Amino acid sequence: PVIKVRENEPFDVALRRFKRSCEKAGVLAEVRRREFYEKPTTERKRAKASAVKRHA
Amino acid sequence: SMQDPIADMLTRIRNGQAANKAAVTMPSSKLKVAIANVLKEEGFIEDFKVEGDTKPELELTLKYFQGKAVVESIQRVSRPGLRIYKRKDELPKVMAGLGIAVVSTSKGVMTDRAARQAGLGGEIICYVA
Amino acid sequence: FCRFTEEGVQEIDYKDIATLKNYITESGKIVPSRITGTRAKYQRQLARAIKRARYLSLLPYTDRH
RNA sequence: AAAAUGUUCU
RNA sequence: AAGCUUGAGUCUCGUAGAGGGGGGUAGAAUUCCAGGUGUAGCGGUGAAAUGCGUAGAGAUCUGGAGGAAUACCGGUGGCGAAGGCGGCCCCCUGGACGAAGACUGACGCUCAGGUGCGAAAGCGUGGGGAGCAAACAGGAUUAGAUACCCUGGUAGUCCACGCCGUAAACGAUGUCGACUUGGAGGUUGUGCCCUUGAGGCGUGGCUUCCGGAGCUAACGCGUUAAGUCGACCGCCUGGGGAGUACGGCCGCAAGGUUAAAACUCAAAUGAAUUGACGGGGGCCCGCACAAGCGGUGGAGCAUGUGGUUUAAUUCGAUGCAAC
Numbered sequence: 001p002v003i004k005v006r007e008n009e010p011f012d013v014a015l016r017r018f019k020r021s022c023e024k025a026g027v028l029a030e031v032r033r034r035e036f037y038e039k040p041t042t043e044r045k046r047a048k049a050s051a052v053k054r055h056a
Numbered sequence: 057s058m059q060d061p062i063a064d065m066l067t068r069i070r071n072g073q074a075a076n077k078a079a080v081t082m083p084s085s086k087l088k089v090a091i092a093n094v095l096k097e098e099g100f101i102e103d104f105k106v107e108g109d110t111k112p113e114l115e116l117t118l119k120y121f122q123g124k125a126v127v128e129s130i131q132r133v134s135r136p137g138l139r140i141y142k143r144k145d146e147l148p149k150v151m152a153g154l155g156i157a158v159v160s161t162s163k164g165v166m167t168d169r170a171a172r173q174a175g176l177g178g179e180i181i182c183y184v185a
Numbered sequence: 186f187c188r189f190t191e192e193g194v195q196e197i198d199y200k201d202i203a204t205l206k207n208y209i210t211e212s213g214k215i216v217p218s219r220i221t222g223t224r225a226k227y228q229r230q231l232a233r234a235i236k237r238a239r240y241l242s243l244l245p246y247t248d249r250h
Numbered sequence: 251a252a253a254a255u256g257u258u259c260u
Numbered sequence: 261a262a263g264c265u266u267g268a269g270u271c272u273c274g275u276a277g278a279g280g281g282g283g284g285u286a287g288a289a290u291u292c293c294a295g296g297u298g299u300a301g302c303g304g305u306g307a308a309a310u311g312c313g314u315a316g317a318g319a320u321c322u323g324g325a326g327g328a329a330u331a332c333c334g335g336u337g338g339c340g341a342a343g344g345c346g347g348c349c350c351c352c353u354g355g356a357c358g359a360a361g362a363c364u365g366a367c368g369c370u371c372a373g374g375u376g377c378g379a380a381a382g383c384g385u386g387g388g389g390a391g392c393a394a395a396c397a398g399g400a401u402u403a404g405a406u407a408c409c410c411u412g413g414u415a416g417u418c419c420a421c422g423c424c425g426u427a428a429a430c431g432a433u434g435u436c437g438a439c440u441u442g443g444a445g446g447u448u449g450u451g452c453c454c455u456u457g458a459g460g461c462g463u464g465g466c467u468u469c470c471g472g473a474g475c476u477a478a479c480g481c482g483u484u485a486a487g488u489c490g491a492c493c494g495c496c497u498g499g500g501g502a503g504u505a506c507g508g509c510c511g512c513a514a515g516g517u518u519a520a521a522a523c524u525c526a527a528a529u530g531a532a533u534u535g536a537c538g539g540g541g542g543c544c545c546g547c548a549c550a551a552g553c554g555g556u557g558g559a560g561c562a563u564g565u566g567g568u569u570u571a572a573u574u575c576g577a578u579g580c581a582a583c
């Protein structure tokens with residue numbers, strides 16, 4: 001999520017933009033996922049659950 | 057594999073009856089044809105049509121008396137994994153003669169009663185109720 | 186809306202970076218099929234192409250170097 | 251963060 | 261004995277695929293090393309400590325080494341007989357599917373014994389060894405804590421060639437075939453159509469979800485069945501004893517496999533139902549908390565209780581709901 005403040009632009013706005021970019025990337029989430037090792041089986045189960053949820 | 061044709065045919069008939077199919081088609085066979093004829097004679101189907109030269113399709117027109125099936129049940133007694141041959145004395149009767157046993161005999165495929173009359177029995181192909 | 190299908194392509198080209206880099210995000214990640222609306226086969230092909238590009242260093246793996 | 255158990259037969 | 265083409269195969273052209281084996285390499289990241297910058301913390305947790313750090317850690321940049329795994333794509337997506345298989349590239353290689361047509365002509369299906377493959381762990385010899393991590397150690401937590409948390413950390417995880425041969429190896433559903441209402445998708449072909457546009461109409465393969473009949477103990481399953489039938493094999497006969505003992509066979513061992521008996525219980529089990537409970541979820545409430553104020557528990561006395569004492573200290577009330 002590389003950002004650079006353009007000419008005549010507030011700080012807060014820039015920060016917000018950066019945050020948005022990060023969210024889009026999925027950086028924090030990714031990090032969280034990689035904080036601990038999930039067993040492949042566990043991961044698969046999770047995926048399945050997600051799929052089920054999606055079927056509304 | 058298609059290891060019993062007669063049985064398969066019977067099953068098809070039964071399924072048709074269940075699902076309210078006006079007709080039921082399958083690969084024809086001489087024995088199969090005979091069976092169909094017998095059924096027709098006895099009263100359980102309307103008509104059978106053996107349509108084709110190289111690959112003949114037997115097409116049975118199923119009956120539906122008062123919105124339900126005429127063929128109450130249709131079980132193979134004889135089957136490839138265990139054949140059943142009855143002597144004249146042994147010959148079965150389906151629902152105390154309110155339903156037929158298609159038996160293959162030395163003088164053609166016929167209902168059990170017919171066989172009995174003749175003075176013979178044989179491979180009891182299928183109970184039709 | 187899948188573009189590749191519309192175009193009528195037999196396979197996506199790794200050499201065609203201009204097309205590919207619409208389907209990779211700013212960070213360098215390969216964009217999802219559900220988002221871009223790509224057909225599944227095409228998506229796989231596209232991904233492969235992207236990978237190839239990265240290997241050859243036409244596209245970047247990530248936006249760090 | 252930490253919270254163990256419940257004498258028998260009715 | 262002769263045939264036939266529907267089953268089963270073969271060929272033509274394509275198709276998608278983490279199918280398998282071998283070999284290359286790519287980038288990110290962790291670790292370590294060397295060097296620079298810099299300074300009191302870093303690290304960790306619930307909080308701590310162990311640990312690492314003024315010998316300069318952590319942070320931060322540069323260069324290197326290595327090992328392992330391949331973010332995103334990534335999808336009840338795909339392929340594989342199942343196990344499983346995930347960066348990209350190449351070489352070898354198996355299957356599946358479709359399109360037509362041509363050919364063989366029942367060559368099929370199933371299969372005890374047998375043979376092969378078979379996750380993970382494990383074992384054997386030799387390599388490798390970053391990260392993770394049984395064991396182990398220390399620190400915590402604890403009443404104890406041979407655990408969960410932390411810090412480390414060896415075997416193992418990686419590779420090569422063998423062995424092991426089991427898993428909730430599961431869809432807890434043997435294989436092959438036929439048939440029976442539908443819908444919503446996914447995936448991958450293919451024929452047709454002014455593609456007048458991302459479309460329209462089919463027809464196949466594989467596959468997820470719902471759901472009809474029917475089946476089921478119900479749960480559910482339901483054209484990929486747990487429906488309807490057929491072929492073949494496997495397995496079951498109350499629970500515990502026990503998948504244990506003995507023996508055999510297999511294994512380097514671990515063990516596996518085959519598989520009892522006595523004795524013993526009158527249950528064991530499944531599904532669902534009403535409750536209750538949950539250190540499950542949601543909504544809501546009462547001096548329930550919070551917010552306050554005043555107490556009690558400390559003292560002296562009054563009073564009741566327990567206990568002890570007593571000849572008797574009448575009997576009863578004894579968690580809130582007795583005192």
Ligand SMILES: [Mg+2]
Nearest residue numbers: 264265364365
């Ligand atoms: Mg011929």
Ligand SMILES: [Mg+2]
Nearest residue numbers: 380381382417
């Ligand atoms: Mg292993």
Ligand SMILES: [Mg+2]
Nearest residue numbers: 393410411412
């Ligand atoms: Mg540990």
Ligand SMILES: [Mg+2]
Nearest residue numbers: 397398399406
């Ligand atoms: Mg310890």
Ligand SMILES: [Mg+2]
Nearest residue numbers: 382383384416
């Ligand atoms: Mg080893």
Ligand SMILES: [Mg+2]
Nearest residue numbers: 426427429503
């Ligand atoms: Mg087993």
Ligand SMILES: [Mg+2]
Nearest residue numbers: 044048430431
């Ligand atoms: Mg599963």
Ligand SMILES: [Mg+2]
Nearest residue numbers: 428429430432
């Ligand atoms: Mg089983």
Ligand SMILES: [Mg+2]
Nearest residue numbers: 470471481482
């Ligand atoms: Mg269903």
Ligand SMILES: [Mg+2]
Nearest residue numbers: 503504516517
């Ligand atoms: Mg044993």
Ligand SMILES: [Mg+2]
Nearest residue numbers: 529530531532
């Ligand atoms: Mg229950």
Ligand SMILES: [Mg+2]
Nearest residue numbers: 549550551552
């Ligand atoms: Mg209060």
Ligand SMILES: [Mg+2]
Nearest residue numbers: 556557558559
């Ligand atoms: Mg007192």
Ligand SMILES: [Mg+2]
Nearest residue numbers: 556557558559
């Ligand atoms: Mg007082």
Ligand SMILES: [Mg+2]
Nearest residue numbers: 565574575576
């Ligand atoms: Mg008293």
